[PDB]
Short mmCIF file of N, CA, C and O in Angstrom, two decimals:
data_model
loop_
_atom_site.label_atom_id
_atom_site.label_comp_id
_atom_site.label_asym_id
_atom_site.label_seq_id
_atom_site.Cartn_x
_atom_site.Cartn_y
_atom_site.Cartn_z
N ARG R 1 18.31 -8.80 65.38
CA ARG R 1 18.99 -9.79 66.20
C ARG R 1 18.01 -10.88 66.64
O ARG R 1 16.83 -10.89 66.26
N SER R 2 18.51 -11.80 67.46
CA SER R 2 17.69 -12.92 67.91
C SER R 2 16.56 -12.45 68.81
O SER R 2 15.39 -12.82 68.61
N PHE R 3 16.87 -11.62 69.82
CA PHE R 3 15.86 -11.23 70.80
C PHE R 3 14.80 -10.32 70.18
O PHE R 3 13.63 -10.36 70.59
N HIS R 4 15.19 -9.50 69.20
CA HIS R 4 14.21 -8.64 68.54
C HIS R 4 13.13 -9.46 67.85
O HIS R 4 11.95 -9.08 67.89
N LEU R 5 13.50 -10.56 67.21
CA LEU R 5 12.52 -11.46 66.62
C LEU R 5 11.81 -12.32 67.65
O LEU R 5 10.63 -12.65 67.48
N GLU R 6 12.51 -12.70 68.73
CA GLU R 6 11.88 -13.49 69.78
C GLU R 6 10.72 -12.73 70.43
O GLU R 6 9.64 -13.29 70.64
N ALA R 7 10.93 -11.45 70.74
CA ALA R 7 9.87 -10.65 71.34
C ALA R 7 8.69 -10.48 70.39
O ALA R 7 7.53 -10.55 70.81
N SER R 8 8.98 -10.27 69.11
CA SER R 8 7.91 -10.16 68.12
C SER R 8 7.12 -11.47 68.02
O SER R 8 5.90 -11.45 67.85
N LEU R 9 7.81 -12.61 68.13
CA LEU R 9 7.11 -13.89 68.11
C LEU R 9 6.26 -14.08 69.36
O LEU R 9 5.13 -14.59 69.26
N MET R 10 6.76 -13.67 70.53
CA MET R 10 5.93 -13.69 71.73
C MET R 10 4.66 -12.87 71.53
O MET R 10 3.56 -13.31 71.87
N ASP R 11 4.80 -11.66 70.97
CA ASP R 11 3.64 -10.81 70.75
C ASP R 11 2.67 -11.43 69.75
O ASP R 11 1.45 -11.45 69.98
N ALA R 12 3.19 -11.95 68.63
CA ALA R 12 2.35 -12.51 67.59
C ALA R 12 1.74 -13.84 68.00
O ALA R 12 0.85 -14.34 67.31
N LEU R 13 2.23 -14.45 69.08
CA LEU R 13 1.54 -15.60 69.65
C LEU R 13 0.52 -15.19 70.71
O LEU R 13 -0.52 -15.84 70.84
N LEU R 14 0.81 -14.13 71.47
CA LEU R 14 -0.17 -13.64 72.44
C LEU R 14 -1.42 -13.13 71.74
O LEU R 14 -2.54 -13.44 72.17
N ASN R 15 -1.27 -12.37 70.67
CA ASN R 15 -2.40 -11.99 69.84
C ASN R 15 -2.47 -12.91 68.62
O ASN R 15 -1.49 -13.58 68.28
N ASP R 16 -3.64 -12.95 67.98
CA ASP R 16 -3.82 -13.88 66.87
C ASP R 16 -2.89 -13.57 65.71
O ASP R 16 -1.95 -14.32 65.46
N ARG R 17 -3.14 -12.44 65.01
CA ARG R 17 -2.32 -11.88 63.93
C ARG R 17 -1.57 -12.95 63.13
O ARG R 17 -0.34 -13.00 63.18
N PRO R 18 -2.29 -13.82 62.41
CA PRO R 18 -1.61 -14.94 61.74
C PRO R 18 -0.59 -14.53 60.70
O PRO R 18 0.36 -15.28 60.44
N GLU R 19 -0.77 -13.37 60.07
CA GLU R 19 0.15 -12.95 59.01
C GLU R 19 1.55 -12.71 59.56
O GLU R 19 2.54 -13.11 58.94
N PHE R 20 1.65 -12.06 60.72
CA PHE R 20 2.96 -11.83 61.33
C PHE R 20 3.62 -13.14 61.70
O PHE R 20 4.83 -13.31 61.52
N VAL R 21 2.84 -14.09 62.23
CA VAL R 21 3.38 -15.41 62.55
C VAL R 21 3.92 -16.09 61.30
O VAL R 21 5.03 -16.63 61.30
N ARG R 22 3.13 -16.07 60.22
CA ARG R 22 3.57 -16.68 58.98
C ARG R 22 4.87 -16.06 58.49
O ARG R 22 5.82 -16.77 58.14
N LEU R 23 4.95 -14.73 58.50
CA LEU R 23 6.16 -14.05 58.04
C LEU R 23 7.36 -14.41 58.91
O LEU R 23 8.45 -14.69 58.40
N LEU R 24 7.17 -14.42 60.23
CA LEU R 24 8.30 -14.66 61.13
C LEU R 24 8.85 -16.07 60.97
O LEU R 24 10.06 -16.25 60.76
N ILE R 25 7.99 -17.09 61.05
CA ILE R 25 8.50 -18.45 60.88
C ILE R 25 8.96 -18.71 59.44
O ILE R 25 9.86 -19.54 59.22
N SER R 26 8.40 -18.01 58.45
CA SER R 26 8.94 -18.12 57.10
C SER R 26 10.37 -17.60 57.04
O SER R 26 11.22 -18.20 56.37
N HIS R 27 10.65 -16.49 57.72
CA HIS R 27 11.99 -15.93 57.72
C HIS R 27 12.95 -16.71 58.62
O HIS R 27 14.17 -16.56 58.45
N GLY R 28 12.45 -17.52 59.54
CA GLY R 28 13.31 -18.36 60.35
C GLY R 28 13.56 -17.87 61.76
O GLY R 28 14.00 -16.73 61.96
N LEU R 29 13.27 -18.72 62.75
CA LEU R 29 13.54 -18.42 64.15
C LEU R 29 14.38 -19.52 64.78
O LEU R 29 14.87 -20.42 64.09
N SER R 30 14.54 -19.46 66.11
CA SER R 30 15.36 -20.46 66.80
C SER R 30 14.59 -21.76 66.98
O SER R 30 15.04 -22.83 66.54
N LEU R 31 13.44 -21.70 67.65
CA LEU R 31 12.58 -22.86 67.92
C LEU R 31 13.26 -23.87 68.84
O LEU R 31 12.69 -24.93 69.12
N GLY R 32 14.47 -23.56 69.30
CA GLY R 32 15.16 -24.41 70.25
C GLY R 32 15.43 -23.69 71.55
O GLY R 32 15.49 -24.30 72.62
N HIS R 33 15.60 -22.37 71.46
CA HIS R 33 15.73 -21.51 72.63
C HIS R 33 14.49 -20.67 72.88
O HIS R 33 14.43 -19.95 73.88
N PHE R 34 13.50 -20.74 71.98
CA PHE R 34 12.26 -20.00 72.13
C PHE R 34 11.27 -20.70 73.06
O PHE R 34 10.28 -20.08 73.47
N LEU R 35 11.53 -21.95 73.43
CA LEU R 35 10.59 -22.77 74.19
C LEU R 35 11.04 -23.00 75.62
O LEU R 35 10.92 -24.11 76.15
N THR R 36 11.58 -21.97 76.27
CA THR R 36 11.94 -22.10 77.68
C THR R 36 10.67 -22.22 78.53
O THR R 36 9.62 -21.69 78.17
N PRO R 37 10.75 -22.93 79.66
CA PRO R 37 9.54 -23.12 80.48
C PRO R 37 8.92 -21.82 80.96
O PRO R 37 7.69 -21.76 81.13
N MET R 38 9.72 -20.77 81.18
CA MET R 38 9.15 -19.48 81.54
C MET R 38 8.26 -18.95 80.43
O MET R 38 7.15 -18.45 80.68
N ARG R 39 8.72 -19.05 79.18
CA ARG R 39 7.90 -18.61 78.05
C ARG R 39 6.68 -19.51 77.88
O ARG R 39 5.60 -19.03 77.50
N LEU R 40 6.84 -20.81 78.13
CA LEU R 40 5.68 -21.70 78.11
C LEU R 40 4.62 -21.25 79.10
O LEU R 40 3.43 -21.17 78.77
N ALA R 41 5.03 -20.94 80.33
CA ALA R 41 4.09 -20.47 81.34
C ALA R 41 3.47 -19.14 80.94
O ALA R 41 2.27 -18.91 81.15
N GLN R 42 4.27 -18.24 80.37
CA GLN R 42 3.75 -16.94 79.95
C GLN R 42 2.69 -17.09 78.87
O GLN R 42 1.64 -16.43 78.93
N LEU R 43 2.93 -17.94 77.88
CA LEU R 43 1.94 -18.17 76.84
C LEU R 43 0.71 -18.88 77.38
O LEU R 43 -0.42 -18.59 76.97
N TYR R 44 0.90 -19.82 78.31
CA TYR R 44 -0.25 -20.49 78.92
C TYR R 44 -1.10 -19.52 79.73
O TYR R 44 -2.32 -19.70 79.83
N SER R 45 -0.48 -18.49 80.30
CA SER R 45 -1.21 -17.50 81.08
C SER R 45 -2.10 -16.61 80.22
O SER R 45 -2.90 -15.84 80.78
N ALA R 46 -1.98 -16.68 78.90
CA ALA R 46 -2.76 -15.83 78.00
C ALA R 46 -4.21 -16.28 77.86
O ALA R 46 -4.97 -15.63 77.13
N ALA R 47 -4.61 -17.37 78.52
CA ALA R 47 -5.98 -17.83 78.43
C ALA R 47 -6.93 -16.83 79.08
O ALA R 47 -6.62 -16.24 80.12
N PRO R 48 -8.10 -16.60 78.47
CA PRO R 48 -9.07 -15.66 79.06
C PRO R 48 -9.57 -16.17 80.41
O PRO R 48 -9.71 -17.37 80.62
N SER R 49 -9.83 -15.23 81.32
CA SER R 49 -10.34 -15.59 82.63
C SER R 49 -11.73 -16.20 82.53
O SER R 49 -12.03 -17.22 83.17
N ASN R 50 -12.60 -15.60 81.72
CA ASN R 50 -13.96 -16.10 81.52
C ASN R 50 -14.04 -17.05 80.33
O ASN R 50 -14.84 -16.86 79.41
#
């Protein structure tokens, strides 16, 4: 479903794992509902403290 791939995309963006990212966007995602400001803040929070 949509959310099952959305969560996998969140994970594959939080960690590097470029192969999973390539496979996911190759298979097709939303890219219109995946960019909510909450998710933007969550991904921005992934920056290392040091």
